[PDB]
Design a protein around this ligand. Structure first.
Ligand SMILES: OC[C@@H](CC1CCCCC1)Nc1ncnc2[nH]ccc12
Length: 167
């Protein structure tokens, strides 16, 4: 039993809700919140910009030190950093950005990072400003993640389409 509330159950391990991931994280304080990161951990907009803003830019400060030490992530890769005031940990995961021409096949590799964590709060990878089809992202999530994932979908209209079209 966990403290996630109001989710629709899609499969044995995947749950979905119309919610602002920032407000969800602040309420639940999960062990792991997933950020929709880029390889430079430049948290300018989308989920990343919103999460970073909620940390008063502490996420960005920590991320800049991470990059200065380690260099950029790989598309499809991840790193674990602090969750600041939002969660114990933040798993920064880089899904392919279609608006940069990146290979959508890397979306499965991106979701594989979730399997290293027993429970996660997460957005749909490569959705939103990353340009991928969210219905496809949900399908890859369900077919790749085996651990317990609670998906927050900001847009109510998109949430209803994801549920109604789910196979
Ligand atoms: O998938 C990443 C983005 C994409 C959006 C595209 C337009 C329709 C709504 C989704 N989703 C989010 N999901 C949960 N919380 C969020 N906070 C800020 C952004 C955000």
């Amino acid at each position: 039993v966990n403290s996630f509330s109001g989710y629709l159950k899609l499969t044995d391990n995947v749950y979905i809700k119309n919610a602002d991931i920032v407000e969800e994280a602040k309420k639940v304080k999960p062990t792991v919140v997933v950020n929709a990161a880029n390889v430079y951990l430049k948290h300018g907009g989308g989920v990343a910009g919103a999460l970073n803003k909620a940390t008063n830019n502490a996420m960005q400060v920590e991320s800049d030190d991470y990059i200065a030490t380690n260099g950029p992530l790989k598309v499809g890769g991840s790193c674990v950093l602090s969750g600041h005031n939002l969660a114990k940990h933040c798993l920064h995961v880089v899904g392919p950005n279609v608006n940069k021409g990146e290979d959508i096949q890397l979306l499965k590799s991106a979701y594989e990072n979730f399997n290293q964590h027993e429970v996660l709060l997460a957005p749909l990878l490569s959705a939103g400003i990353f340009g991928a089809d969210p219905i496809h992202s949900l399908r890859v999530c369900v077919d790749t993640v085996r651990t317990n994932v609670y998906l927050a979908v900001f847009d109510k209209n998109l949430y209803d389409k994801l549920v109604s079209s789910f196979l």
